[PDB]
Design a binder for this molecule. Structure first.
Ligand SMILES: OC[C@H]1O[C@H](O)[C@H](O)[C@@H](O)[C@@H]1O
Length: 395
């Protein structure tokens, strides 16, 4: 009669687009007789959710299912805190359809310990179509063209860059800025954590670009939620936003269409590469009674029909490679094709900002340097020195 199974889910999907996509999963589970106890922890990018999580686990109160990124997953797998999903994954044939870069994180010590939802990526620009057309309509391909477009936006009297001053958002931009100096440089810096690279003249140029981008954000940017920056571009109050494709979730929620109302492009100099992050659900070992629901949730997440429906709304690519792009809009189709290509070419690189490039300690030490340099507290020359010391001290 009434539902007899239930999942208690900690996640940070609280903005309108994110909430819309999550509704897809909730409805899916409900049809299976599984109700939902919602434990949302608001805060873009999940830092706040992870803080709540740590205190809860220390208190012997781990949630049944937890939204999680990258090296964070590994950290709990190492501790043996996560449920083994093998019996679902082996039987459902996950090995054949989940890209190897995601399996590095979804698997630990020979076992599936998370169910990957999607493949977001961070190196996008969201451009207001009306403002672009006012600016002559040319999509910027390189750095100089980007600056020329931002200058036109500025003379149009709008805020050229919609941005929120929070360390993770600053890092999100820096993903793409570093990426624009080439995939080799990005790997050397954020994946290999090579100190010569991190201290290079090229990294000094990257910070100089952040200074330039800083000059085009509005004076009230500090502390603004990412989705409120997205809204500025949606409303035509700002020209463009540099953000992961969760931003598209907002545009679609507002009824805006690719081509007509907005343009979606890779960050100039990064087409042909992606800086990826994959939201996964980790099922924490709790009561033995909860395991059937946990396994059902993992199965639901990896179902082809859900993999399409959820990601269409979310603004990410499916985690499964065998899910067709048919129901995706023009930007979602690009996301999928860019992922297949980057995967083939070895330019599908873990996002630093969103926890796929390096461990939390390193990520956080990078956040601090990037934030202070963007906010103008630190010169590019000094930022380079401090980045090397912070990274070396965190490894
Ligand atoms: O909160 C903003 C975004 O940040 C996170 O890193 C997630 O991967 C994405 O699902 C979410 O929409």
């Amino acid at each position: 009669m009434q539902d007899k199974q239930n999942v208690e889910v900690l996640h940070w999907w609280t903005a309108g687009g994110e909430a819309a996509a999550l509704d897809v999963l909730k409805k899916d589970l409900e049809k299976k007789g599984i109700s939902w106890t919602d434990m949302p922890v608001a805060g873009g990018g999940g830092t706040e959710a992870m803080t709540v999580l740590r205190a809860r686990v220390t208190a012997g109160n781990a949630p049944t299912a937890v939204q999680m990124l990258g090296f964070d997953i590994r950290d709990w797998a190492e501790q043996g805190a996560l449920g083994n999903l093998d019996e679902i994954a082996n039987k459902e044939g996950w090995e054949k359809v989940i890209p190897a870069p995601l399996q590095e994180f979804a698997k630990y010590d020979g076992h599936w310990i998370a169910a990957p939802v999607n493949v977001h990526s961070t190196n996008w620009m969201w451009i207001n179509k009306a403002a672009l057309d006012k600016a002559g309509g040319k999509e910027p391909t390189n750095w100089d063209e980007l600056i020329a477009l931002l200058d036109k936006f500025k003379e149009q009297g709008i805020t050229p860059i919609a941005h929120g001053g929070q360390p993770w958002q600053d890092a999100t931009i820096f993903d793409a800025v570093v990426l624009s100096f080439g995939t080799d440089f990005y790997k050397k810096a954020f994946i290999d954590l090579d100190p010569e690279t991190l201290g290079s003249d090229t990294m000094k140029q990257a910070f100089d670009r952040m200074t330039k981008l800083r000059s085009y954000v509005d004076d009230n940017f500090s502390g603004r939620d990412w989705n409120l920056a997205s809204a500025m571009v949606i409303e035509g109050k700002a020209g463009l936003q540099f953000m992961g494709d969760w931003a598209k979730g907002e545009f679609v929620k507002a009824g805006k269409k690719p081509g007509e109302d907005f343009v979606c492009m890779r960050y100039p100099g990064t087409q042909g590469a992606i800086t990826f992050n994959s939201d996964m659900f980790a099922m924490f070992k709790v009561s033995e009674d909860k395991v059937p629901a946990q396994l059902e949730m993992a199965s639901a997440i990896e179902s082809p029909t859900f993999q399409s429906a959820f990601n269409v709304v979310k603004g990410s690519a499916p985690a499964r490679t065998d899910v067709p792009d048919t129901d995706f809009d023009a930007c979602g189709k690009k996301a999928i094709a860019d992922e297949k290509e980057a995967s083939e070419k070895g330019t599908m690189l873990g996002s630093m900002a969103h926890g796929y490039a390096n461990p939390a300690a390193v990520k956080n030490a990078i956040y601090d340097v990037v934030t202070r340099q963007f906010n103008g507290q630190l010169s590019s020359e000094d930022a380079v020195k401090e980045l090397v010391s912070a990274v070396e001290g965190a490894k």
